[PDB]
Design a protein around this ligand. Structure first.
Ligand SMILES: [Zn+2]
Lengths: 55, 69, 65, 24, 91, 212
RNA sequence: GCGUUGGAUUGUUCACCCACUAAUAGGGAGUGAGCUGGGUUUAGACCGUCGUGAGACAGGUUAGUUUUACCCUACUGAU
RNA sequence: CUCUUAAGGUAGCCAAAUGGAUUAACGAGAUUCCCACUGUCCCUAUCUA
RNA sequence: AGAACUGGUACGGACAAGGGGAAUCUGACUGUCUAAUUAAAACAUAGCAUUGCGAUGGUCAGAAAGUGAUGUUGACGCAAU
RNA sequence: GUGAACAGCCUCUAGUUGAUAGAAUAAUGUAGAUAAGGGAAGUCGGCAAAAUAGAUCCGUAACUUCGGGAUAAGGAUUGGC
RNA sequence: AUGGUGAACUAUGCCUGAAUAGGGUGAAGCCAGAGGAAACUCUGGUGGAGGCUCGUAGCGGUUCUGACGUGCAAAUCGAUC
């Protein structure tokens, strides 16, 4: 999923496309956020701090 | 028999002359120093009799009072 | 005394252990023995790297290693 | 310690690194 | 239509037994269930015979074969070798 | 201690083979003057699968030289045999597939199966499906015939020993994985109670030395 | 003389936090056959250590039947 | 008897689709969390055999 | 299946009958055992691989046999792993 | 008959009225339920209850060995003439 | 230690008989339509195999601060699986 800004639309579109939602009918933003943080912790989404520049 | 007997192994190794120093339970494995090391795990129990009484104190538990000087 | 009977394992029968109940100068290069070979124990809280030696001369007292 | 080339290692083929997926 | 993608006849096995064993079994299963021409007719009516037998639905003939084929290639090679040795001994 | 499971196999109580479904003991025709100095024709009336065996057992028929009666025999079904074939059996028989011939008469390198280990045993070697011996040589003096056994070890044998031509039918049966325990149970039901084979590490020390 | 609170944390809890309240002070009989988790945890098993092996052990996890009184007395009611 | 250290900018050289064990399904196995839910509780009360 | 009408607090009207979802450790599974405390990461499982054996043989049983199981067997087999 | 069904209930032929009972409905118990507002704040721990349950239609994601997940999830309806 | 007794319960091999409602998913095989010179790539049909699944009888007893545990029972009962 893409096109998000401020990450609120990110969580909403992700909960909609993933099929996760609270009954009638709001998306479960908290549960999708849990999977987002779990993917960030497990390394499923690549990321790394920039190494310091060489002398 | 016959070569598996511990006396036969002591003759083949030349250890039969060691005399009384041999530890109890010595065999082809666990040289006597190894037996003295393994025995420490069970050495903490104190001996006792029918009375009962401490016929011998537990290791490092003699209870005797040294005369420090 | 001077040797607490530490007990270990699910069944505390042999207990295979002793521990000092008093202060000890373990030394700078202690490097704790592995626990499987550890019979005697000298817990770090009882250890001291310094002593309050006092010099009878001049009446002075100083903490020294 | 001797020389140790880092090129023998193969980085994990994470889904976000593959070019097969794209949007827009 | 081709409802299956690649599981073929082995899709009855389902998710169990994995993919590699499923393919190794699918190959021999397609080899076994396939019809074969009878040498005494040439009609495509031969059917499997409990691992080795291969009865012709017509002509009621029976012929020995492989566990999953009417004739393993090694058997055809041994037969050609026996034929060569026989034609050589005859001369 | 206690008796190990392998030691109980000799008692025979439950380890005996379930022979009821077997069609019979496969065997070559008993040696006779006809094969010693000629050959006897014999139709293969039918082939049928044998329980507890990896290849079909052929049912050849033969007339009795000494009496007016047919004499059926359960030959192993060599690959490429067909019903109604005239399975010649004798020292003079041609090297057609499925015929039984003495190993000495065959040209060197000839393929054969169910060859006798010694004369009169009615077939001992390569009885399993897909196996065949090779006649790698000949020693006409002190008649003997070197042969390559399916295991690959060489072995000498008397030239008089008989052996059907061609590989045994049903080879390649092991190529297919069984894919499940139930086929293994259905296969071992005809053979013996050797399966399931419990691991020795899981046995109690009284049961196996490996246990404990 | 009367009050001295509702809970989170077990990659543990001989502990501390927020919030209210005037305040959330310290102790004995505790209630180990009133009930309960950690635990006195025997019979199953696995991971790591020792030991040639049998087995436990510097450890940890998992699942595991101790079942009042109608007897006497005390107390609350009732002739 | 000498003697051990370079790797650059968001995905790379690549080995004859993939570089997987961080494995899908399955489980009266154990564990963490979310929606509904309700007397577990605030605070207990009532009816039936 | 479709089109009007109609009583509803109701409409699989009692009966009947999954709660669902996001993850971790463990074992692939179907399956089986401690009858009477432990049903499990335990046992078993097809798959993977080693060893000995070509019959005067390999694993064995039997006081012994002109004895017996594998063997109505033969290396694509047997027996221990 | 109802019902997808030898799922649950009533009835037909047929077989039974057998389980010690009479009088009230105390406390405390076993079994089946209801409850204003919060909805796990109780408990080591969602221990037990409850909640969706059948059917028609829309729709169903990550992963994956492509076979499965799946009745995923989330939604509209069910009566009678 | 000596001599005898047991597989009617329970462990296993074998022989011979008996028992296993109703639904969901849809494999080979085959039929028709649309593309490509062909393999073949799809669409619409029949098919009912899965050591499939939900769910009766049957099998076993995972779970209850459940009943009783001087019990109906020296292992049962209700729910649940
Ligand atoms: Zn034909």
């Amino acid at each position: 999923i893409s096109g998000w800004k401020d990450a609120t639309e990110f969580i909403e579109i992700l909960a909609r496309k993933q099929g996760r939602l609270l009954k009638g009918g709001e998306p479960d933003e908290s549960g999708v956020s849990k999977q987002i943080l779990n993917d960030f912790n497990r390394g499923k989404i690549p990321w790394f701090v920039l190494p310091p520049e060489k002398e | 028999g016959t070569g598996k007997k511990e006396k036969s192994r002591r003759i083949r190794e030349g250890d039969t002359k060691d005399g009384n120093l041999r530890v109890k339970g010595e065999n082809f494995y666990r040289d006597s120093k190894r037996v003295k090391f393994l025995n420490m795990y069970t050495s903490g129990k104190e001996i006792r009799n029918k009375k009962g009484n401490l016929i011998r104190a537990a290791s490092f538990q003699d209870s005797t009072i040294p005369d420090a000087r | 005394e001077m040797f607490k009977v530490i007990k270990t394992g699910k069944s505390r029968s042999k207990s295979w252990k002793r521990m000092i109940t008093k202060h000890t100068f373990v030394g700078e290069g202690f490097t704790r023995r592995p626990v499987k070979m550890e019979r005697i124990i000298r817990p770090s809280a009882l250890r001291q790297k310094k002593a309050n030696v006092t010099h009878p001369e001049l009446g002075v007292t100083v903490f020294l290693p | 310690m001797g020389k140790q080339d880092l090129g023998k290692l193969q980085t994990r083929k994470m889904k976000g690194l593959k070019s097969k997926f794209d949007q827009g | 239509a081709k409802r299956t993608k690649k599981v073929g006849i082995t899709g009855k096995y389902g998710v169990r037994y994995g993919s590699s064993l499923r393919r190794q079994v699918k190959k021999l299963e397609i080899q076994q269930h396939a019809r074969y021409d009878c040498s005494f007719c040439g009609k495509k009516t031969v059917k499997r015979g409990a691992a080795g037998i291969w009865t012709c639905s017509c002509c009621k003939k029976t012929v020995a074969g492989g566990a999953y084929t009417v004739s393993t290639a090694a058997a055809a090679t041994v037969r050609s070798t026996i034929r060569r040795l026989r034609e050589m001994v005859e001369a | 201690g206690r008796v190990i499971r392998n030691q109980r196999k000799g008692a025979g109580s439950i380890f005996t083979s379930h022979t009821r479904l077997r069609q019979g003991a496969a065997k070559l025709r008993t040696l006779d003057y006809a094969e010693r100095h000629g050959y006897i024709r014999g139709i293969v009336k039918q082939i049928v699968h044998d329980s507890g065996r990896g290849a079909p057992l052929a049912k050849v028929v033969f007339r009795d030289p000494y009496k007016y009666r047919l004499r059926e025999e359960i030959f192993i079904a060599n690959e490429g045999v067909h019903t109604g074939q005239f399975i010649y059996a004798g020292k003079k028989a041609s090297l057609n597939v499925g015929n039984v011939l003495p190993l000495g008469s065959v040209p060197e390198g000839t393929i054969v199966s169910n060859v006798e280990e010694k004369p009169g045993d009615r077939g001992a070697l390569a009885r399993a499906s897909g196996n065949y011996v090779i006649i790698i040589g000949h020693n006409p003096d002190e008649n003997k015939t070197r042969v390559r056994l399916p295991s690959g070890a060489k072995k000498v044998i008397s030239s008089d020993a008989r052996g059907v031509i061609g590989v045994i039918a049903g080879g390649g049966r092991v190529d297919k994985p069984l894919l499940k325990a139930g086929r293994a149970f259905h296969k071992y039901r005809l053979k013996r109670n050797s399966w399931p084979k419990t691991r020795g590490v899981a046995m109690n020390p009284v049961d196996h030395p490996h246990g404990g």
